[PDB]
């Protein structure tokens, strides 16, 4: 969903590298 | 080539005859323009570099574009768009705008920059909106794409701007070639999209030329901002991936401003000169976050109030 889509960018642009 | 004197006499005919179809209009005469369209030499291939695409290295060539579209139909537009996109490499303004060719511009160079950018860019929004089909923009997106290293135009000003004009035409044009042509574009620009972001140096020398503290960068997102918007979730992560270093160096120099503020704001005396300085860093404070939310929005992120989190 669209959700889920922006929930997994979060966690990988909040990613130290 | 070439040479000089051969183009200069080019503007100088082109001029004359752009000059006799604005008389004849005004005087309610009957205009006949292929004259004009001969003299611009498009359809030619007898030189290295084409005589049109040598004439736009030349500000006298630049300022006559707005007054020969009006004596054009719709195709001969089209002819002078696919020459522009198919040599954009070996365009001169490019060579001058690209930090890589041109890390250190004279701010003559930056002005001749910026007369390209607020007249071709205005030309091709205007012919590219009302009205081009389709079919036509998806040529100039693949004429621009085989027939030039796409991360170094990337690296121009004008050209990170002219592929933003495409993709957000291309997003706005259908309501799944386009998904086979963004594709093609992603390819070329994929372990390279940072390459957009100029160097410290070169933005550092870009301020001293023009006296300023902050340099605008809200094309570089916007460009992000389109590339996203027309991208599913694998293009995305990748933006994200290749970018995140750009975001949170943004952030960084928007809290930096936000501290600065603050610190400013307490103090009990405040003359018309303190009020000037907190108003620059309210206005360069808030300009930050609103260019990084242009691209973040668009993925459903948002920046606010110091972190950034799912768009409500
Ligand atoms: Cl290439
Ligand atoms: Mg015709």
């Given at each position: 969903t669209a959700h889920s889509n922006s929930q997994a960018l979060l966690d990988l642009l909040k990613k130290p590298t | 080539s070439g040479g000089k004197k051969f183009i200069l006499e080019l503007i100088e005919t082109v001029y004359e005859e752009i000059l006799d179809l604005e008389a004849n209009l005004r005087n309610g005469q009957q205009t006949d323009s292929t004259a004009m369209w001969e003299a611009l030499?498009?359809?030619?291939?007898?030189?290295?570099?084409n005589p049109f695409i040598s004439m736009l290295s030349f500000d006298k060539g630049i300022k006559i574009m707005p007054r020969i579209f009006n004596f054009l139909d719709k195709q001969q537009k089209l002819k002078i768009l696919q020459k522009i996109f198919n040599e954009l490499s070996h365009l001169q303004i490019i060579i001058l705008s690209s930090y890589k060719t041109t890390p250190k511009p004279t701010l003559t160079q930056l002005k001749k920059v910026d007369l390209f950018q607020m007249i071709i860019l205005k030309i091709i929004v205007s012919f590219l909106s009302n009205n081009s089909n389709f079919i036509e923009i998806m040529g100039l997106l693949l004429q621009l794409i085989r027939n030039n290293n796409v991360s170094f135009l990337t690296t121009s000003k004008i050209g990170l701007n002219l592929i933003t004009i495409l993709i957000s035409r291309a997003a706005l044009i259908k309501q799944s070639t386009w998904n086979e042509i963004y594709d093609k574009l992603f390819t070329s620009l994929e372990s390279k999209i940072q390459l957009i972001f100029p160097p410290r140096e070169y933005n550092d020398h870009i301020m001293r030329l023009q006296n300023?503290?902050?340099?605008?960068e809200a094309y570089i997102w916007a460009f992000l901002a389109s590339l996203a918007a027309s991208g599913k979730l694998n293009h995305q992560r990748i933006i994200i991936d290749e970018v995140r270093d750009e975001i949170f160096a943004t952030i960084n120099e928007a809290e930096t401003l936000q501290k600065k503020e603050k610190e400013l704001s307490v103090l009990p005396q405040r003359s018309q000169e303190l009020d000037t300085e907190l108003k620059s860093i309210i206005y360069n404070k808030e300009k930050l976050y609103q260019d990084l939310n242009l691209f973040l929005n668009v993925m459903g992120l948002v920046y606010r109030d110091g972190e950034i989190s799912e768009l409500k």
């Open positions: - | 030499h498009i359809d030619d291939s007898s030189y290295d570099v300023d503290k902050f340099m605008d």
